[PDB]
Design a protein around this nucleic acid. Structure first.
Ligand code: NA
Ligand code: NA
Ligand code: NA
Ligand code: NA
Length: 327
DNA sequence: CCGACACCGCATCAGC
DNA sequence: GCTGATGCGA
DNA sequence: GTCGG
């Protein structure tokens, strides 16, 4: 990835715009347009010299080109400078960094004078359970997880899962499975041969055991199929304790497990390609299944999948390691 | 010109 | 009390 | 905001 000294002023600007669209204007599609513009620029291996040059990249249109022209000539953007000094908008944007506070909650809070973390601390009674946990770990949740801590975390998850029942299958996916040197959270996919698409406490038993050994510390949400919560590695005596971390655990039917693992391994870019390719060979892939497409476009019934490689074999692609699924 | 821009599990609200 | 909608995060 | 039917 080209040094961000290249176009970092431009991509930072676009990302800041993206956030205000999402969190203040509640314009999720403009949020994503700015994100896509910023991504394509961040990978452009030349220092951009004009809006017209940037406009050639897919996802950069007339308006962002105009904004790049103004940034290059003046070193700033009038609209962005203004919105940053706006006390109401900057506060709404900021509050959304608390897990559980979205654009709607943030606007309600700022409306009633609640603008800072200290204001949230004073008003516990107006926070729901999720938002209280997000406040508690506000700083911890914004730190990344070094891969060595993810390995220590994996060790615990895989040990305790097998202890509940040695027939469970658990896989830590996300960028960690692709080999990333750091993670933002831990995404665990779980299955059991007794659970198929046409097969009730399989998830709870695992959560309970991880809570019993004091790895899981808090629960954001928990149902029959998805757990979302908080975990923390055990601290060695005297040594500073580790930050609390976000962990999700999903229970997936066995016949859909490897479609799940393939999907939640990613990357997002590799996933678009593989589904693009799959289409071009007569198959439709989603996170659950791969199905054949007839000539008139009618999807037939899901194909049996017993490994990730089964999916690749169907679409006439050679198996690619997680480490090579960057695109 | 103008619709798409992913889908869904869970917590919680809004309406009956 | 139930049912569907909405907010949130993925 | 951008793309494309
Ligand atoms: Na463009
Ligand atoms: Na938030
Ligand atoms: Na956020
Ligand atoms: Na056993």
């Amino acid at each position: 990835a080209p040094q961000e000294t290249l176009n970092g002023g431009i991509t930072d600007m676009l990302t800041e715009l993206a956030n205000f669209e999402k969190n203040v204007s509640q314009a999720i599609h403009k949020y994503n347009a700015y994100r896509k513009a910023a991504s394509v620029i961040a990978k452009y291996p030349h220092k951009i010299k004009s809006g017209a040059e940037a406009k050639k990249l897919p996802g950069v249109g007339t308006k962002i080109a105009e904004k790049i022209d103004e940034f290059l000539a003046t070193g700033k953007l009038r609209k962005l400078e203004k919105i940053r000094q706006d006390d109401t908008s900057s506060s709404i944007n900021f509050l959304t960094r608390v897990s559980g506070i979205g654009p709607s909650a943030a606007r309600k809070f700022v409306d009633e004078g609640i603008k800072t973390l200290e204001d949230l601390r004073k008003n516990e009674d107006k926070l729901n359970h999720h938002q209280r946990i997000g406040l508690k770990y506000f700083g911890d949740f914004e730190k990344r997880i070094p891969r060595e801590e993810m390995l220590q975390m994996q060790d615990i998850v895989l040990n305790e899962v097998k202890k509940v029942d040695s027939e469970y299958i658990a896989t830590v996916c996300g960028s960690f499975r692709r080999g990333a040197e750091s993670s933002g959270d831990m995404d665990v996919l779980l299955t059991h041969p007794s659970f198929t698409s046409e097969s009730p406490k399989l998830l709870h038993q695992v959560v309970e055991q991880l809570q019993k050994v004091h790895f899981i510390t808090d629960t954001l949400s928990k149902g029959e199929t998805k757990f979302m919560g908080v975990c923390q590695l055990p601290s060695k005596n005297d040594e500073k304790e580790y930050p609390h971390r976000r962990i999700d655990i999903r229970l997936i039917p066995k016949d859909q497990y490897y479609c799940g693992v393939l999907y939640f391994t990613g990357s997002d870019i590799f996933n678009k390609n593989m589904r693009a390719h799959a289409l071009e060979k007569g198959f439709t892939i989603n996170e659950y299944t791969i199905r054949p497409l007839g000539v008139t476009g009618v999807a037939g019934e899901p194909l049996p999948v017993d490994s990730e490689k089964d999916i690749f074999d169907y679409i006439q692609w050679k198996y690619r390691e997680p480490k090579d699924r960057s695109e």
